[PDB]
Amino acid sequence: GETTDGVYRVMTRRLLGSTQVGVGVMQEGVFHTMWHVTKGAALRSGEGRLDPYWGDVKQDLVSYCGPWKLDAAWDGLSEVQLLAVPPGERAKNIQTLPGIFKTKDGDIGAVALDYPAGTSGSPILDKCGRVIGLYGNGVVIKNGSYVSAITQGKRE
Amino acid sequence: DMYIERAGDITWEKDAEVTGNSPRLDVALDESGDFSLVE
Numbered sequence: 001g002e003t004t005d006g007v008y009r010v011m012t013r014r015l016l017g018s019t020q021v022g023v024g025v026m027q028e029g030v031f032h033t034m035w036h037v038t039k040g041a042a043l044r045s046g047e048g049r050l051d052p053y054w055g056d057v058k059q060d061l062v063s064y065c066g067p068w069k070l071d072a073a074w075d076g077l078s079e080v081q082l083l084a085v086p087p088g089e090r091a092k093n094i095q096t097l098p099g100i101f102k103t104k105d106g107d108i109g110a111v112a113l114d115y116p117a118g119t120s121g122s123p124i125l126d127k128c129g130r131v132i133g134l135y136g137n138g139v140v141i142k143n144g145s146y147v148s149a150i151t152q153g154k155r156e
Numbered sequence: 157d158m159y160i161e162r163a164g165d166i167t168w169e170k171d172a173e174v175t176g177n178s179p180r181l182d183v184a185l186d187e188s189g190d191f192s193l194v195e
């Protein structure tokens with residue numbers, strides 16, 4: 001059905017009413033979301049069907065209809081925009097300067113904005129509007145707030 | 157059965173609400189894709 005580029009909500013009718021379980025990016029005919037949103041299940045776009053094409057639990061990413069297309073990266077210096085799409089609420093851009101997740105295999109950018117778990121898959125953008133990663137996989141700091149990594153896939 | 161609904165365009169918006177801090181955290185990533193704090 002709808003293949004227009006943009007940000008989309010991921011819904012389910014399996015629980016009470018219609019519940020938003022996550023968000024995703026449609027780019028070049030491919031739907032990009034986080035693995036924990038769909039668990040790799042098929043998606044519906046009106047009457048059409050989207051089937052998983054690539055995915056990986058450790059990266060926490062999944063693509064539908066084709067390979068992962070998003071390959072822009074955080075430059076390590078500039079502010080970014082979380083284009084947050086919260087459940088029941090309108091899409092809204094939030095500007096922030098990312099922090100850093102220091103790991104044994106290198107450093108990843110991290111955005112310290114706390115949003116409901118159903119916001120997982122919302123894109124993080126650079127000044128050019130390019131998607132540098134998705135929000136929804138991180139850690140819970142001492143305060144109770146969530147700090148998400150800027151999770152980016154690999155364009156083959 | 158899951159379904160998608162369009163929520164908007166992907167564009168940078170000037171004069172957007174600037175918030176959030178920039179913490180440097182020591183983390184570990186496990187085989188199940190879950191992050192944890194290392195202290």
Ligand SMILES: O=C(Nc1ccc2c(c1)CNC2)c1cccc2nc(C(F)(F)F)[nH]c12
Nearest residue numbers: 036060115116117120136137146188189190
């Ligand atoms: O739990 C989340 N994300 C996630 C879930 C399941 C899995 C993974 C990540 C990766 N491996 C499987 C989550 C995403 C966005 C905001 C979140 N706030 C909280 C809260 F409540 F703990 F503060 N968790 C949040």
